[PDB]
Design a protein around this nucleic acid. Structure first.
Ligand SMILES: CC[C@H]1OC(=O)[C@H](C)[C@@H](O[C@H]2C[C@@](C)(OC)[C@@H](O)[C@H](C)O2)[C@H](C)[C@@H](O[C@@H]2O[C@H](C)C[C@H](N(C)C)[C@H]2O)[C@](C)(O)C[C@@H](C)C(=O)[C@H](C)[C@@H](O)[C@]1(C)O
Lengths: 64, 96, 50, 7, 75
RNA sequence: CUUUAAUGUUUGAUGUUCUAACGUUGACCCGUAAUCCGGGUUGCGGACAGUGUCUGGUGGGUAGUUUGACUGGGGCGGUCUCCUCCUAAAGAGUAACGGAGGAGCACGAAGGUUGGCUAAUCCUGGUCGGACAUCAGGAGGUUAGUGCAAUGGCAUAAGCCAGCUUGACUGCGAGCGUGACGGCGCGAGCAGGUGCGAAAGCAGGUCAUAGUGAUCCGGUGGUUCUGAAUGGAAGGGCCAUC
RNA sequence: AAUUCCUUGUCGGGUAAGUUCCGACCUGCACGAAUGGCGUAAUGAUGGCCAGGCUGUCUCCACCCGAGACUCAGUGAAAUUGAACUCGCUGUGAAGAUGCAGUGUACCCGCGGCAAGACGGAAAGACCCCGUGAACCUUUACUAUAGCUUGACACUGAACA
RNA sequence: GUUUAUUAAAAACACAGCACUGUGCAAACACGAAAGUGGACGUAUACGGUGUGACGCCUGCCCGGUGCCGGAAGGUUAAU
RNA sequence: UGUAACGGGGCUAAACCAUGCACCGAAGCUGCGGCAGCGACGCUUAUGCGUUGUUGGGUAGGGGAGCGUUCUGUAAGCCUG
RNA sequence: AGGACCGAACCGACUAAUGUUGAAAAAUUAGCGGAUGACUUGUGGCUGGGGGUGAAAGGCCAAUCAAACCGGGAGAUAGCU
RNA sequence: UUUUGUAUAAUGGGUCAGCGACUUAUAUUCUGUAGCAAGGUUAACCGAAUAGGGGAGCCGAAGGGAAACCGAGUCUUAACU
């Protein structure tokens, strides 16, 4: 058979131009009002995936 | 993606965005295949008859990669800035 | 702990609010707190709400 | 029968 | 009854004498002001001393209390 | 709005009665040589019982499972996250069921700015007033104080007082520091709009380091961003937030 | 005390001497009245204790009679086994040596005996611990469910008050 | 009397007797997706369950907890 | 259990202290012979030949190069009473 | 008369000894208990696996029982040797 | 063999002979090699057929953004030095 994609990985990551992955930062869902606005401003753009993380991510997204 | 019972990386991060259904029916074309079409007119029909886009494609951009030299007439396709510059400099009418 | 969560809502061009904490047993007084609004781009009066 | 066993 | 200790928070002098820094580089992380800010050096809200200009780092003793100061020479 | 009252407009509840549903493991006759069954008379019940669907309770009767780890063996006890000091061998880091203490907050002022001021503890003198309240002077120099544990700091005060205030502001951010990562921290400067100050300037919380939980799932508000033929809408997305 | 920890409680009887036994006393750690209390004739391949008789149980073994063991002829296994030219001691050593070091002793090979050693054989220790093992059992652990039980609708109709 | 066939024959289990409780007969209860069988071709001096265990003397106090029984005015409460 | 606390014999130095000169002593180093890896430096690169230097203990593991067995083609070939 | 008494057949299994690669995968020998009953035995039926049956030990159900055997899921799964 | 460590008195094996354990399928990523090269390649199927057709499709040559959309730029932002 063909390989199945881990679908939560396809909901979490997106492929970019040089083959890296972009993801959303993880602290911005709830109790934000005790977080400073500098924290919430810095957690707002999409980041890139680090390299041991990239090794574990490439296995879960085998197609795209 | 098993990390030893630690919560995995694809489950530690928030899922984001949605999937649009209009992005499947849109195919950008470059200018290099603009000479590949039969005849000198470029519309949806001849772009499908020349195997450039596909059957389910409804919309197209004709963006600037390069290599356009002949007068072509583009009908109903959205054209970018630099692409319409290079097309009108090649000679043919951009839209009618 | 005893600080309740309250929000403070814009007066002019309310498409915006801030959120803060307030103790009820010491201060039942209102916030008004002339903060900045990014929607109307000015410093407006804000008001206490739940 | 726990006589030879180290119990 | 014992058995608790916090994680060590990596304080200390990051950039020593004569080192070339860019502006915005962190020179000293500290709790109080063991070192005080001098020329081209700013003091952060947790008393971090950082480079406000790019040059070389310099340590001095100054003032009537023989206190440590960190200066930067714009090279 | 209120208190009963006739009349019709409609149901409900309760009780009694009737028999024609249904029951009969009552009697009798036939199939039939039959204590099965069916059918026919008749008696007794009778719209009850019982059965189907839906539903509340109960249910170790039965079933599927769970019942943490560290641990000078395991159990019992204690601990599990965060902060400060020592161990820690003068960069950073560094274990033990090693030695000691705290946190799970508070505050629209205890935040910002401007202006001003400077302790502890003793000695002397003086109404009650006395070891210790208030006053005045002297000594001393930070042994004080910091909203809260410890350490580092603090006089240019970060300590104490008063005026005016909301920068406890929005979008970013060169550059670094620290983590395997998720993450965490510091930050000059730029755009917009303010506060204090005569001005240089300072302010995007608090002397600093604890006061905290990822994701999923949903709640609320805004934004046509999408919106399954089309126009909406639902539902998603994004932004703020629980 | 089938119950009592401290404990061989203390006193008495039985014995030359009695942690057991019998009778008492109550300090009942922690008896107790149908998960019965306290008695009780008879019964018991029932538990404990004492006595008489009787004896090789014993002091302390001796002899005899038969069946094996022993030799001869016939037939003929089994467990076990890395290979062996398979000594003692003291030390060392994965920490208790036939095998290493040092040393001492010892012609080669059987047969009958005995079992100190070969950490002898036998059974992938049954105790202990571990596995995000398993099975059964328990319950006011969780989630269900058969059954029992409640009401609504259906089978199900007619009069009245 | 019975019991662990193959390490336990007992003080265990049974027993006659005692008490409580259910059951009015298409009985309770049990085995049965049901029909139907057992109870019983018996019917409260009968049948089932539970505890105790001949006989003698007797079985004291507690209904707070839990279980059962009875009430149901009031509060809460499903499908509809 | 048997001296049994120099390994033993034995030693009045064959013990200890100092000074020195010899010598023994390893798979170390040198000599001679050979093989292989890696890297420089040339000959004309049959991607070789040579000169120089250096390397060559190895578990888990990584990399490279081979031997042999059965069957298929070459092979109705070749060997074989 | 008697779940009376003593005691053979018959039924059982209290003690000891022997056997323990047995003569025997539960015996023999010498004593032992019941022996007209809640007895024993033949022949034939019936009850069945979360089931039966049990004067109850988790005992017995074909040398197998805190869930028989056979076959199939099935090469269950095994961070373990 | 397992180990920090075994002559170990830790495991395993009486011996010989024979058999006995990293496979296959399908996808995906990287490396080597071959073809073609801004192009490459067909699947089923037809076809007397490992030929030749069949370009349905797939990958690549463009990305940014959640998306609409824009496009060598795009996103954030009222707009970015
Ligand atoms: C008829 C002959 C039988 O043996 C016995 O009766 C002897 C008398 C047992 O002891 C019996 C009786 C008794 C009391 O031991 C004497 C009891 O403790 C043991 C459990 O069973 C033996 C030896 C037991 O071993 C012991 O097992 C203990 C768990 C560990 C002990 N080891 C540490 C030394 C070991 O020797 C054990 C398991 O039965 C051995 C296994 C191999 C057997 O099952 C074999 C087939 C035996 O049944 C047997 C040879 O037929």
């Amino acid at each position: 058979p063909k390989i199945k994609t881990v679908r939560g990985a396809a909901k979490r990551f997106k492929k970019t131009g040089k083959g890296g992955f972009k993801h959303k930062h993880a602290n911005l869902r709830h109790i934000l009002t005790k977080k400073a606005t500098k924290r919430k401003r810095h957690l707002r753009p999409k980041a890139m995936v680090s390299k041991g993380d990239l090794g574990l991510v490439i296995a879960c997204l085998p197609y795209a | 993606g098993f990390e030893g019972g630690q919560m995995p990386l694809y489950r530690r991060l928030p899922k984001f965005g949605f999937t649009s259904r209009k992005a499947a029916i849109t195919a950008e074309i470059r200018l290099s295949d603009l000479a590949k079409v039969e005849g000198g007119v470029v519309d949806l029909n001849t772009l499908k008859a020349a195997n450039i886009i596909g059957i389910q494609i409804e919309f197209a951009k004709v963006i600037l990669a390069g290599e356009v030299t002949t007068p072509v007439t583009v009908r109903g396709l959205r054209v970018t800035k630099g692409a319409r510059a290079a097309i009108e400099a090649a000679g043919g009418k951009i839209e009618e | 702990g005893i600080r309740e969560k309250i929000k403070l809502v814009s007066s002019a061009g309310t498409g915006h609010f801030y959120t803060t904490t307030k103790n009820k047993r010491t201060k039942p007084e209102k916030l008004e707190l002339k903060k900045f609004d990014p929607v109307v781009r000015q410093h407006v009066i804000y008001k206490e709400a739940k | 029968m726990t006589h030879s066993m180290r119990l | 009854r014992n058995g608790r200790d916090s994680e060590a928070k990596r304080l200390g002098v990051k950039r020593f004498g004569g080192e070339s820094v860019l502006a915005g580089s962190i020179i000293v992380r500290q709790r109080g002001t063991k070192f005080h800010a001098g020329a081209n050096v700013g003091c952060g809200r947790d008393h971090t001393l950082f480079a406000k200009a790019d040059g070389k780092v310099k340590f001095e003793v100054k003032g009537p209390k023989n206190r440590k100061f960190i200066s930067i020479e714009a090279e």
